[PDB]
Structures are given as C-alpha cells and as structure tokens.
C-alpha cells in the first residue's frame, strides 16, 4: 500500500540525501536518490581506504538476511566512479521493507564529489534498462513486491533554501498536492533509460537586450535528474546562453556571474508540452565557496552527451515538483508550493 515518505537533507543546494537501512538487524546509511542512474551501492566493510573508514560501511557478516552474489560491478558517473562486487539483502525506506535487493559493495571510489560526500552511496531511480549488471533497481523491486499498491509513481520535492529545516522528500507511491500549486503538466518518456523526454524550446528574454536568446530552437531532448545539481546542456548552446547572461569561464566546469549584478539577470524558460517553465536568477544562480572565495555560479553548464540532451537537475527540480510515473512512462511537472 504505502505511500512511503523519504525525508531529504539539503547540503548547500548541491546535493540531497536521505536515510536507508540494509540488512537484519538494520545497518543505517545516507544515500543520494538519483533519477539519473539505476544502481544501489554502499561502501563495503571489506574496504579499509580513507574513504571507507570515514563513511558508513555495509557488513554482510552481521546480517542474517544477506545473500552472496559476488559479480564485479563498475559504474561511471559524471562526477565520479565506483567499483566493487554485488550482494543482496533487505533494503528499508521508511516503513517499506524491500526484500532481496541487490546492492553494490564498493571497494574503489573515485571523484571528490563522492569521496568527500556527506552521503555513503547512491540509490538509483532510473529505468532498469541502464542498471549495471542488470540488477533490479530498488523502485522496480518495490513494484514487483506490490508495495505501492496501484500507484507506481514517486514524486520529488527539493527545497531550494538550504537555511530551511526540511531539505526535500522522495514520496514513494504517491503525489502530494501539498507540495505543488496549480495542475500537473505531463510529458511522455521517449527513450526508457534515463527519465528522458522531448523539450519544445529554451529561451531568455531580457528587458535590457534588444534581442532574445532562443535555444533548443528546433526542439531537443532532456532528462529529469535529481542527482545532477545544475542544468546541463549541449556545450554550444550553453556557451551562448551564458554569453547572453554575462557568464564567463577561464577555468573549471562552470560559468561565473558577477555577484553584484545578479538582480539584472533575465529569467530563463523551458517550454515542455507547450507550457512555459520559468527560472528566475534566484532559481538558477548557485552560491559556491571555493579556494577561500564566494562565487556566483551560473546554473547552466555544458555537458556533451552521446546524443545531445539537457539534464534538468536540482536547479529545475526544486521550483518544479516532479512526478516520475512508471505506470504510464511519463514525467509530470508542477509549480512547487
């Protein structure tokens, strides 16, 4: 039946993570809930690296419900990588008890974003078609076990104010109208892997510029990815968008904005299923501290994908409450409440 509300912590508007347990008795972890990947993994007790010793580790030998598998697994992310071996155990999210859940026991991890993370691992919520080693994803296993009843969706709220107490929620098996206003706009999934769909256009129309900036001019593809902080796009288009906004880059992976000029920045709008989804500069500028300085990072970054697409990460998924619907293979967006 359910539904199962999973509460999230918001670290600096860049990552969101929540509690799970594995095994019998429960071993507790924090994981990022990631609609851009399909695998669950945690650091192994068989790992004694600096990384593993400063995170929560899974010890199969203390779990009476553990079952061995032992296949090698390797996963590559935009911001890191992981390798280890597969095991299977009970996985709990709130009051949901997900039996026989494959997980990766991580032995080697790379990427600062993972190595210094406040979370222990990643719980993928993408389609099973992209699961490394073909192992059943958590949500798929919930559906197989009938834990959502007849409502095989999950809905994500991300708070974009890190000073606020409640970071966010993943609601398994429901849509909470107390997290949105108006009506949901749905878009059908195209390629089932990521939560991928067609976008009609992307634009910015400044009051201070003679011309608008019209991107994704002939339509484009996008994904909804809770595990991406910003919005990514085809580099050529993101370069131009940042030029229109006054973003500059001579190092790193992001464009920077003058922190004293943010109030003059125009909205940027994504048109999806014929409806406009606007982002104010308050929505798309991320405060970051690096190397002793406060920066204002443009929330539009370039990323070349195998087939060009835009990744709509937390910058978008905060102001728009998002419904991930596996009964109808569609994504819903509504203005957050």
């Amino acid at each position: 039946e359910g539904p199962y509300p999973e509460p999230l912590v918001n670290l600096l508007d860049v990552v969101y993570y929540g509690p799970i347990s594995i095994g019998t008795p429960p071993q507790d972890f924090q994981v990022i809930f990631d609609t851009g990947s399909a695998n669950l993994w945690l650091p192994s007790s068989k790992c004694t690296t600096k990384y593993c010793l400063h995170h929560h580790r899974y010890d199969s030998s203390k779990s009476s419900t553990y079952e061995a598998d032992g296949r090698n697994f390797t996963i590559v992310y935009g911001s890191g990588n992981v390798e280890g071996f597969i095991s299977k155990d009970v996985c709990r999210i709130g009051s949901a008890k997900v039996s026989g859940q494959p997980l990766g026991e991580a032995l080697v991890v790379g990427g600062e974003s993972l190595l210094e993370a406040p979370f222990d691992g990643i719980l993928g919520l993408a389609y099973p078609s992209i699961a490394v080693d073909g192992v059943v994803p958590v949500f798929d296993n919930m559906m197989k076990q009938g834990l959502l009843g007849e409502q095989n969706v999950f809905s994500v709220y991300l708070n974009r104010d890190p000073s606020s107490k409640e970071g966010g929620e993943v609601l398994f098996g429901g849509i909470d109208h107390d997290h949105y206003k108006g009506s949901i706009t749905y878009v059908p999934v195209t390629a089932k892997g990521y939560w991928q769909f067609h976008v009609d256009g992307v634009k910015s129309v400044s009051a201070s510029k003679s011309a608008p900036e019209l991107l994704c001019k002939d339509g484009c593809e996008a994904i909804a990815d809770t595990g991406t902080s910003l919005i990514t796009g085809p580099p050529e288009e993101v370069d131009s968008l940042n030029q229109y906004l006054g973003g500059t880059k001579t190092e790193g992976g992001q464009y920077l904005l003058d922190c004293d000029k943010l109030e003059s920045l125009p909205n940027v709008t994504f048109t999806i299923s014929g409806k406009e989804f606007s982002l104010r500069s308050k929505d798309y500028v991320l405060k970051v501290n690096q190397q002793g300085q406060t920066l204002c990072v443009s929330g539009f970054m370039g990323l070349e994908m195998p087939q060009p697409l835009w990744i709509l990460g937390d910058v978008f998924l905060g102001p728009y409450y998002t419904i991930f619907d596996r009964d109808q293979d569609r994504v819903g967006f509504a203005e957050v409440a």
Binding site: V14, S37, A126, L286, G313
Partner: peptide, 6 residues
Amino acid sequence: XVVXAX
C-alpha cells in the same frame, strides 16, 4: 556541483 551515470 555534481552530475550522477554515463
């Protein structure tokens, strides 16, 4: 930030 699987 971060970009989650390729």
